[PDB]
């Protein structure tokens, strides 16, 4: 799991039978200080989180009980300490 | 998954038999400004895509299910991307 | 499996079914000298780790094990660690 | 999966009994232009590579369908490689 | 699968029950060139590994009730690397 930021959004109509109805997000990967690291990331929108949101997002097989998805966001943050 | 343009494509004759009829194509992974970097994948192409389209790549056990020995294929074209800031 | 050091913890109210009621941490990677490299991550608590505390963070579908959406989970708190 | 390219072998008698009777080659991953980058890793021979050769990797679960422990192993050995621009 | 080097050793009480009598190794990722690079990682040992000794560790699922995900799967008998 990581923190990420929703950048914005993908859409495609030419998709696999599994990604169906789903929501595509571009996710930026945040560090410990919430800045922002080179990474993005194309993940499955579940919980319904909105552009600027800070989200945490699974990665992997874990993504899969949300498929071929292998990123979804799992949850929305509402407060970090470090 | 991430973002992907099909650079070319690669052809082998003594394959597995799980990759037997696939299409292996060039990937090369794309920022958010779909300007690609350095990083670059054999993919499994699976809803047909040609050269210099941008299409979106899933990779691990998820790919599998496109007995395969598949970690990374094309589970669809990009129609629109969207890149935002908000306040 | 790598060597970590609880930095923080992550509040989350809208998050997924199967993350009620977990414990979600904030663990940097550490190096052999248990010295942190920039990689962080943001693990499920099991074993009860607090603030400052070395951990053992196992990552991928061995994380499951703690129909999860875990993909990183601490298995074992540190005692000691040596670098022969 | 990816390109790379046999650069040596591994041998080993203490294994586990799911690396019984295979060749462990040294593969070092090559980029799109065919340029090998500083990665290396050990995988299973499978198609039956030789020193030298251009094969196609691959790696996580998906290597263990060749109870394995291999989670890198080689799936076809590459006849050609086109890498292209349009428009 | 990758190259290593068992640099130490680590000791934890209060461990998942998966990881009860397990010997937790610290192996250095080693390239071609038998040269550790930066990368470190906590493997299981299964075949009896010793300070100082090459093995081969595989990494994942393929490692593994287990929440191991990354073993000691052989030890390195020779290496070679034609060029
Ligand atoms: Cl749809
Ligand atoms: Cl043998
Ligand atoms: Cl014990």
Same mark, same amino acid.
């Given at each position: 799991?990581?923190?990420?930021?929703?950048?914005?959004?993908?859409?495609?109509?030419?998709?696999?039978?599994?990604?169906?109805?789903?929501?595509?997000?571009?996710?930026?990967?945040?560090?410990?200080?919430?800045?922002? =690291?080179?990474?993005?990331?194309?993940? &499955? !929108? #579940? %919980?319904?989180?909105?552009?600027?949101?800070?989200?945490?997002?699974?990665?992997?097989?874990?993504?899969?009980?949300?498929?071929?998805? =292998?990123?979804?966001?799992?949850?929305? &943050? !509402? #407060? %970090?300490?470090?």
């Amino acid at each position: 799991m990581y923190l990420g930021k929703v950048i914005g959004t993908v859409v495609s109509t030419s998709k696999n039978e599994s990604l169906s109805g789903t929501k595509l997000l571009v996710v930026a990967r945040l560090t410990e200080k919430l800045i922002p =690291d080179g990474s993005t990331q194309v993940v &499955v !929108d #579940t %919980v319904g989180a909105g552009n600027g949101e800070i989200v945490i997002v699974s990665c992997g097989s874990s993504a899969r009980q949300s498929s071929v998805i =292998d990123a979804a966001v799992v949850g929305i &943050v !509402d #407060t %970090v300490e470090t």
